[PDB]
TrEMBL record, chain A:
The keyword Hydrolase belongs to this UniProt entry's keyword annotation: yes
Binding site residues for Mg(2+): N231
Listed PANTHER family: ESTERASE-RELATED (PTHR43039)
Alphabetized GO MF terms: hydrolase activity; metal ion binding
Domain AB hydrolase-1, residue spans: 20-256
Protein name (Swiss-Prot/TrEMBL): Hyposensitive to light 7
Cysteine sulfinic acid (-SO2H): residues carrying this PTM: S95
Record keywords: Hydrolase, Metal-binding
Similarity comment: Belongs to the AB hydrolase superfamily.
From TrEMBL, chain B:
GO-annotated biological processes: SCF-dependent proteasomal ubiquitin-dependent protein catabolic process
Taxon lineage: Eukaryota, Viridiplantae, Streptophyta, Embryophyta, Tracheophyta
Pfam families: F-box_5 (PF18511)
Alphabetized SMART domains for the sequence: LRR_CC
Segments forming domain COI1 F-box: 6-43
Domain of life: Eukaryota
UniProt name for this protein: F-box protein
Organism: Striga hermonthica (Purple witchweed)
Gene Ontology CC entries for this record: nucleus; SCF ubiquitin ligase complex
Length: 269, 641, 130, 338
């Protein structure tokens, strides 16, 4: 078909006037929604795609200059939506990908009818007044590991560091999929995420947002949901589920899927 | 004199003898005469390429007789689809490129694939269908199998040992045209992916349709608990309907599985352990009905007891019998005083394979050795009573002919015990299999040893292999390792590496099978404080670059819960370090970023991701494999100079 | 029976050894196409076949390439299937495990392939799983 | 002399073109270029049909161009033009291949027809090689040409369940009858072949009595405890098994059936189950095997299945239209009294 549809492995399923766009998280691909897609194809038009950093995409198309900032991902998402004639889409995103969708909505409000977010966060590095992510030091370890893996691959030696070698046991679950990419692309995406912060821009989002978090999550504090509700510029709702892990939509489908489907089908927020 | 001065007929004769395809390709580049000779002489071809560029198919292979289309990239892709009208042209393309095909193996992803490709060769003699994917929905049973029946068809052998389907498809297809079934001289249905084995009625109908069968293998259901399970009537129907049988292989579907936790009665949570509807009298009648029988294999997951009389009748009623494989048959060897009995009376056996025999003792092994003096291959599995003395003496008795020994899951026979047991035949054995069990309580040159198979539980090390006795193997060339187990319950290894560098001890080693695919673990998300599968892949693959491997088959560990066998980053990184690799097959999935790691290997020619397990990923959305990724990788590999 | 070589030498042949060769069995019996050493190398094999095997056969193969070519020619002319196919297999053993240049060098072979033709043959060969 | 009049014509025109340039030998490239001429020939139509990019008219003339340059690459021969150049070995090869392809296509029974000839000369390595650089693949057009050419028990359990659930005597007798008859073989059949799986729909408002009912039936016929799967808004601290990890309700059902092919399975609130689960149950009841979320097929065995319904013998008037197919296709439907 189109070049954008071939560079992102875009697939269209289902039928009906309403379109659901599933944006996977960093380190995985559209395969993470294989448990959710059957629940939607009956009465929705599901659009699945892989963002350019994903392992299923061509490593050559990856532009280190464009994708050193989240604006690149938001622009890519807008291009994908506009190519496939998708308007008033319903966006379901995982962590830090829903942020890109939110920025895209800031630029192009007409494309997004609602935003459903799974464990999102505006800024990943917590400051003294901001408890909305992880300490800088605990993530410095993961940056070091990714840099060492890239160095090892440059010399032709195997990259021998994983997220299982960190000590947080929460960085292990958070950063597990960050090592599921080519080491240089992994370094680039990780540095972008570390430098990312959308706190100023939270007031410009007008589309409704449906924040979904895990009960007593060790990884992203539950208070971030209330923080976003207070700073978001549009209607917002927060639901908490008794799930765990970085990928509740895959590891615990019988609990996560009902929540996501409900938030998709109810508009009142 | 030089060869070009030789007459051409003995050139065709001499050059039909190079079977090594790499050597054949090398010979084709010698000169014009040699090229023409090779192209007119090549008989077996396994097609290598992508579906997209299949119209760039060479026509130089006009004289091939056996054609293998199941390895067309992307692996498992529908070669012909009903969605594209020009897919009708693929049949003609193949028909014209290989006009002299008699044996065919094709991947039958879709019914249209069969209906377009198979009837192309009226002289087709042997057919092998492969499908590890889902069975497409059809109007009735056997609709995709009915497409095999062609007007001018004379199909003689049908192979469905890897073609997943409903067991009701076979009898429906076989009943639709009596000519097609009568022409059949061989039928292989030994598919382990069947959810349940064939019913009694289905076996009866299958054998009634095909009275001329010479070889018959089937995956039957022998559990008495189920309804319509195959029992005595099924076997007597086999004996009555197929009197010309020379090979008879009935095994339960669980017995065919790669994982020992599926067929081992000890490892099943009380499953099995109950008698089948198989009597000694019924076995006697069955063996009496097959005077021409040559190869027998009855591998059940349900016990059959007091089978000694049946095995004795085997010796009188099957003079041509050469190979016997018995699964959970008890009392096969019950010696009294000194008179041989049971299987020990089959003096004509050449290979014997027994499994989970409760009655067997050391005297049983001694009787088997003394009676079956022509035995050349012996396989024993899961016998809790036999010891090193009995097995060593049985080896010494058969020291003149025994060249292939497998000793697995024997409680009292560890790795060191097995190697000590094989001492009398140490300088003659060629193929060897042991379990790397280091916890079993209670001049050394393997001069002819060429193949070693190992089984080891997950988390154990391989370093003690040298101290176990397998020290000096000058001729050892291929080793196959299978690792099984559930690592979700296991802690982090205290030792950093599995120890593949220990395999540097054998200088001639050039091929490997690393089957970790039966390890269950956590793919991308571990619950809390657990270790994901990438850690175990690193633990197992470290040091694989040091070995001068030239071929490598790798089975990534799986996560049964989410159904994925992904290749991790450390796995790809370590496999990249193998510079000498020529062929590299990975029986799993890997996305483009990791697949492109392998272009660093200079000598690498054949690479493929083969999902030959059930169930294979249905489409690109459900896994991390994409068709475009495969095409880009292949184009990059071919272009490398 | 007594046979005569091309050079005129005579050798004694057993009846079963004679029946080994279809050409001899169907037909002094001069052999004007084979030399003395050819019979001196083939008769022991014929006798051994008429009446350990692997090692002895490998030892008997331990002959130079040219002598071997004379042997296979003699087997064809005498039309002995076993000797001829064993000989051709033995030669084809040195075919395997060698590059085309190695085959040419070991076999004084002259190369008449243009680079374009070599590339095309390689392209055709890339379709076969080695 | 072994060719049709038209094939003889086109061969001698190839020859005449060979004699006009004196380029040594009559290579099949020349006869292919001859086929490009005489626009009534089939090669033009075949080429335009084979490649979508070939629909452009001047690409066919670009084919002529690439043939022509290769001909220009042929050194000339010092001979009089008033002669026939020796046709190359490749041409005898092509003609013999044409003869053979003609022979095989009608095994019942030679003058070679035009299409066999053109196939044969596309088979020539040089013609195909030249076409390859011209974005044309000889096998595709060749296949196109070839394709165009085609134009007791009852009471022994009734007493126990009447002991347990004495307020549901009539429904208990009805279910006793249906379970005993399907077990004995007097039940529904999956087509002509008999089936072992039993499918029961348990309507009515009494939930605890229904649960003790199925527990008693399990403990009597199979001597085992039932299996606690819920589907509706009835989840509690037992069904919500995170230990299963990546399993939905359908995955749980399939795994339980696989691991325990001999027990009773009760499904809670089939009315509040998702359309996906209900569709999966319909597929299982038709095809006799349950498919889970990964597409694996699992044989139902003969497991006793009971669906705990709540709509108000089961009357068809009280069943919503969506669940009518289930009732029609279920083995039996039992209504519990209030």
């Amino acid at each position: 078909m189109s070049s954008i549809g071939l560079a992102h492995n875009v697939t269209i399923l289902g039928s009906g006037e309403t379109t659901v766009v599933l944006g996977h998280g960093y380190g995985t691909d559209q395969s993470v929604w294989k448990l959710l897609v059957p629940y939607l194809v009956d009465d929705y038009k599901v659009l699945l795609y892989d963002h350019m950093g994903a392992g299923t995409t061509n490593p050559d198309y990856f532009d280190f200059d464009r994708y050193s900032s989240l604006e690149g991902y938001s622009y890519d998402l807008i291009a994908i939506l506009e190519e496939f004639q998708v308007s008033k889409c319903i966006y379901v995103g995982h962590s830090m990908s829903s942020m890109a969708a939110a920025v895209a909505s800031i630029f192009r409000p007409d494309l997004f009818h609602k935003l459903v977010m799974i464990s999102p966060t505006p800024r990943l590095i917590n400051t003294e007044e901001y408890y909305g992510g992880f300490e800088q030091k605990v993530m410095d370890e993961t940056l070091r590991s990714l840099d060492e893996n890239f160095k090892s691959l440059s010399l032709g030696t195997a990259p021998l560091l994983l997220a299982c070698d960190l000590e947080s046991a929460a960085m292990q679950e958070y950063c597990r999929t960050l090592f599921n990419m080519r080491p240089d692309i992994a370094c680039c995406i990780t540095r972008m995420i570390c430098g990312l912060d959308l706190r100023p821009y939270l007031g410009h989002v007008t589309v409704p947002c449906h924040i979904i978090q895990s009960s007593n999550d060790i990884m992203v504090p539950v208070a971030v949901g209330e923080y976003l509700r207070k700073n978001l510029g549009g209607p917002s709702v927060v639901e908490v589920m008794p799930t765990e892990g970085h990928l509740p939509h895959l590891s615990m489908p019988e609990v996560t899927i009902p929540v996501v489907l409900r938030h998709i089908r109810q508009d009142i927020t | 004199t030089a060869l070009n001065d030789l007459p051409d007929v003995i050139l065709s004769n001499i050059m039909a003898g190079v079977s090594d395809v790499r050597s054949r390709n090398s010979a084709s580049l010698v000169c014009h005469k040699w090229y023409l000779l090779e192209r007119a002489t090549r008989s077996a071809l396994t097609l290598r390429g992508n579906i997209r560029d299949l119209f760039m198919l060479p026509t130089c292979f006009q004289s091939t007789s056996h054609l293998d289309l199941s390895l067309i990239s992307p692996w498992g892709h529908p070669l012909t689809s009903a969605a594209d009208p020009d897919s009708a042209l693929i049949g003609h393309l193949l028909r014209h490129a290989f006009p002299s095909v008699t044996s065919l193996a094709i991947y039958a992803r879709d019914p249209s694939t069969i209906h377009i490709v198979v009837p192309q060769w009226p002289d087709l003699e042997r057919l092998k269908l492969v499908r590890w994917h889902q069975r497409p929905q059809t109007d009735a049973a056997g609709d995709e199998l009915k497409l095999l029946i062609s007007e001018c068809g004379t199909l003689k052998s049908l192979d469905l040992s890897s073609f997943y389907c409903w067991t009701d498809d076979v009898p429906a297809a076989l009943g639709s045209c009596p000519t097609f079934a009568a022409n059949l001289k061989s039928l292989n249905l030994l598919n382990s992916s069947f959810s349940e084995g064939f019913k009694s009625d289905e076996i009866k109908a299958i054998t009634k349709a095909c009275p001329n069968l010479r070889e018959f293998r089937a995956s039957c259901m022998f559990d008495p608990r189920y309804i319509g399970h195959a029992g005595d009537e099924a076997l007597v129907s086999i004996s009555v309907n197929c009197p010309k049988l020379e090979i008879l292989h009935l095994a339960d579907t669980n017995a065919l599985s790669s994982a020992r936790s599926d067929f081992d009665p000890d490892e099943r949570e009380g499953l099995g352990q109950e008698e089948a509807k198989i009597n000694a009298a019924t076995l006697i009648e069955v063996f009496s009905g097959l005077p021409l029988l040559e190869e027998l294999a009855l591998d059940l997951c349900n016990n059959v007891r007091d089978s000694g009389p049946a095995l004795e009748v085997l010796n009188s009623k099957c003079p041509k019998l050469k190979s016997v494989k018995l699964g959970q048959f008890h009392g096969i060897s019950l010696p009294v005083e000194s008179k041989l009995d049971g299987i020990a009376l089959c003096q004509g056996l050449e290979s014997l394979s027994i499994r989970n025999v409760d009655d067997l003792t050391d005297m049983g092994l001694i009787a088997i050795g003394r009676g079956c003096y022509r035995l050349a291959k012996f396989e024993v599995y899961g016998c809790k009573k036999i010891t090193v003395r009995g097995m060593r003496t049985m080896a010494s008795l058969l020291r003149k002919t025994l060249v292939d020994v497998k000793i697995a899951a024997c409680k009292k026979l560890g790795a060191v015990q097995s190697l000590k047991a094989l001492e009398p035949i140490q300088d003659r054995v060629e193929r060897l299999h042991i379990d790397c069990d280091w916890d079993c309580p209670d001049d050394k040159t393997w001069a002819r040893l060429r193949y070693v198979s190992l089984w080891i539980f997950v988390g154990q090390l391989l370093t003690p292999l040298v101290a176990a006795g397998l020290n000096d193997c000058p001729e050892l060339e291929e080793i196959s390792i299978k690792v099984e187990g559930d690592c979700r319950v296991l802690s982090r290894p205290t030792v950093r590496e599995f120890g593949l560098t220990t395999l540097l001890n054998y200088p001639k080693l050039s091929r490997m099978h690393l089957d970790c695919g039966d390890i269950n673990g956590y793919a991308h998300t571990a619950p809390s404080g657990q270790m994901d599968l990438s850690l175990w892949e690193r633990f197992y693959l470290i040091g694989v670059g040091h070995l001068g491997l030239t071929e490598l088959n790798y089975w990534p560990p799986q996560d049964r819960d989410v159904n994925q066998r992904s290749l991790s980053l450390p796995a790809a990184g370590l496999l990249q370090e193998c510079n000498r690799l020529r062929k590299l097959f990975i029986h799993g999935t890997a996305h483009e970023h990791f697949m492109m790691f392998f272009l660093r290997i200079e000598g690498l020619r054949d690479v493929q991701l083969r999902a030959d397990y059930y169930p294979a990923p249905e489409n690109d959305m459900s896994t991390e494999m994409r068709a475009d990724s495969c095409s880009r990788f292949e184009v990059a590999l071919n272009r490398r100079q | 029976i007594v046979l005569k070589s091309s050079d005129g030498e005579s050798f004694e042949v057993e009846e079963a050894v004679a029946l080994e060769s279809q050409t001899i069995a169907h037909m002094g019996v001069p052999l004007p196409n084979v030399t003395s050493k050819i019979l001196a190398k083939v008769i022991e094999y014929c006798k051994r076949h008429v009446e350990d095997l692997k090692a002895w056969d490998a030892d008997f193969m331990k002959i130079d390439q040219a002598t071997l070519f004379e042997l296979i020619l003699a087997a064809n002319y005498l039309n002995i299937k076993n000797l001829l196919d064993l000989t051709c297999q033995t030669v084809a053993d040195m075919i395997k495990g060698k590059t085309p240049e190695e085959i040419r060098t070991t076999f004084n072979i002259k190369n008449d392939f243009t680079p374009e033709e070599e590339e095309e043959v390689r392209r055709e060969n890339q379709w076969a799983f080695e | 002399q072994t060719l049709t009049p038209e094939a003889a014509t086109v061969l001698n025109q190839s020859i005449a073109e060979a004699a006009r340039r004196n380029h040594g030998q009559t290579t099949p490239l020349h006869v292919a270029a001859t086929l490009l001429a005489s626009p009534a020939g089939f090669l033009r139509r075949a080429c335009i049909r084979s490649h979508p990019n070939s629909s452009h008219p001047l690409q066919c003339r670009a084919l002529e161009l690439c043939f022509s340059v290769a001909l220009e690459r042929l050194p000339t021969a010092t001979t009089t033009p008033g002669n026939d150049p020796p046709i190359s070995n490749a041409l005898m090869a092509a003609l013999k291949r044409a003869q053979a392809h003609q022979r095989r296509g009608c095994p019942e029974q030679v003058k070679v027809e035009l299409e066999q000839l053109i196939i044969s000369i596309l088979d020539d390595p040089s013609v195909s090689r030249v076409m390859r650089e011209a974005s044309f693949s000889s096998p595709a057009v060749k296949a196109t040409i070839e394709q165009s050419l085609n134009n007791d028990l009852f009471k022994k359990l009734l007493k126990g369940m009447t002991e347990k659930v004495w307020w549901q005597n009539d429904a208990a007798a009805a279910v006793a009858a249906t379970v005993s008859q399907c077990k004995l073989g007097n039940g529904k059949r999956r087509g002509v072949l008999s089936k072992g799986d039993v499918w029961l729909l348990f309507s009515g408002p009494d939930r605890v009595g229904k649960r003790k009912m199925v527990s008693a039936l399990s403990s009597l016929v199979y001597g085992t405890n039932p299996i606690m799967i819920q589907l509706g808004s009835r989840q509690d601290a037992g069904d919500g098994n995170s230990s299963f990890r990546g399993k939905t309700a359908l995955d749980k059902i399939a795994e339980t059936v696989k691991r325990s092919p001999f027990s009773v399975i009760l499904l809670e609130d089939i009315d509040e189950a998702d359309m996906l689960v209900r569709g999966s149950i319909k597929q299982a009841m038709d095809r006799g095997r349950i498919r889970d979320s990964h597409g694996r097929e699992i044989s139902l065995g003969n497991v006793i299945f009971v669906m705990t319904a709540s709509w108000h013998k089961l009357s068809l008037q009280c069943v919503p239209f969506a669940f009518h197919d289930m009732v029609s296709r279920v083995d039996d439907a039992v209504a519990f009294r209030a």
